[PDB]
Amino acid sequence: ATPSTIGVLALDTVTTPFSVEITLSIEETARAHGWNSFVVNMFSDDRPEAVVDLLLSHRPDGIIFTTMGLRQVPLPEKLLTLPCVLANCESLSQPVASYIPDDEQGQYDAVKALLAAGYRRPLCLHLPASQPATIRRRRGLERACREAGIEPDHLSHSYMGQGDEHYHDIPAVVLAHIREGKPGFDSVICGNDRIAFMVYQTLLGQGLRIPQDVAVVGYDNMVGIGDLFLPPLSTVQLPHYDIGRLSALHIIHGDNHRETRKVASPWLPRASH
Amino acid sequence: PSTIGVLALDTVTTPFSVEITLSIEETARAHGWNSFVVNMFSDDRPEAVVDLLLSHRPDGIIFTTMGLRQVPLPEKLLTLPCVLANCESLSQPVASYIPDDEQGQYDAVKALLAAGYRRPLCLHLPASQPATIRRRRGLERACREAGIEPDHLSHSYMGQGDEHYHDIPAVVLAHIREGKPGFDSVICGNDRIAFMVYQTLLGQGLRIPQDVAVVGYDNMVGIGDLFLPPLSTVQLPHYDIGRLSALHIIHGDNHRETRKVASPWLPRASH
């Protein structure tokens, strides 16, 4: 008789090994309750029905489907009947318990802090439009601007194209809003810290100072950087750790609800504003 | 079916080297084997964690560190691992697969000097970290083969802890007199040091690489191609390390040698 076990299916840890804080959080939470936990990673060359059968081989008591990058889970509808809970992803067809970041609250607290600090004309650089978080973050940004008496439709907005090759388009977008060395914005709201990286390199290389000449705000607090920005980047923490914890407890305490719970995305003010 | 038990000692503090455990899991399935991973956190303790992976009763065991270290665990706990990935055993001799830090730094510095640079500022990682001294042998050999005595160059060692990455800007500006730098290039211990270097040089009004070439190390999956211009670096072979470690168990090897895995030079546009 082995202890209770949580089976986890990671759909894309291969292309984005940053959200590993989700699977680590699950493993740590399960151990703090006398449970075990294994993780099956889905690569590109293998295929779903095989991978799902493999995690069923360990015969788990509960199952968690997770995406390292907030997505909508592109798997057969017949394979979305096994997962007791979804971590950082939502099911379009069947309704399943889901724990996702509160993208609208995160972007709102960030933009609210920026405007409150005195900025009024931010350049807004959004992530790909179809990504599920992009539209929720923009609602937060818009709500913060309207509460400050600013119509967000009057600001400069830009959407990135899908793929890391597009991070190199950011510099051209920033320089396009700079006329004869003086910028047509007093701040820059970045879809993520990788966009902030591009922004820092472009502004410093243009002879501008952060934040004396231009404030900057990122999103994610990427475990790989965040504190490496000069100056330290004001950003928003993606709650990968709380997402994994809440997902594990849902199974540990055998919950039956199938609601989509939005986890708090805390604002990390630093020195970029 | 046969199963490989993996013990990750520090994926909590450095979740970048996850490419090792992923590579192990992928290689084991390509041979009809299974594989589980036990992560050691800070709040738990070894004897408990080691007993836990023995619970799954594995056919082979791999001890791995996300950051090349010398494995700070009881000598009696280093008798179970069939192979060590990205780490070495000081006491008992155990089969180990580690990066060829000397070859990696050599190919990098060789390419830099060959491109025409002669006075690089060398920013090394903490001295006690086992790779730091091996990378410096590579750097020195490249410089001596180019007729340069590395003892005449400016060297600096970082202090242990991420808090010290913020000391890099001061070290770079200390080698700049009245706006003109006293170096024509910068050899960085890793891409995180390169990040600090880029921010400091661009903020100083210097151009990369027209005024100062820059070279990193690791090719951090999280950046590398995000540098402006794209950072010339060295790839840490986490993927090959995991693969070779899995095969050692799959094919039941008996040697207890320390194999150095190739660390390939990724030239880009920072030089």
Residue numbers in the entry:
A (entry chain A): 59 to 331
B (entry chain B): 61 to 331
What does the paper say about this structure?
Here, we report the deposition of 14 structures of enzymes from both the core and accessory genomes of sequence type 23 (ST23) K1 hypervirulent K. pneumoniae. Targets were selected using a shotgun approach aimed at uncharacterized metabolic proteins from ST23 K1 hypervirulent K. pneumoniae. In silico multilocus sequence typing of all K. pneumoniae isolates was completed using Kleborate. This analysis showed that 64 of the selected proteins are part of the K. pneumoniae core genome, defined as genes present in at least 95% of all strains; the other 132 proteins are part of the K. pneumoniae accessory genome and are overrepresented in the highly virulent hvKp clonal group CG23, which contains ST23 (7). Thus, the x-ray crystal structures presented here provide the basis for functional analysis of 12 uncharacterized proteins associated with high-risk K. pneumoniae infection.
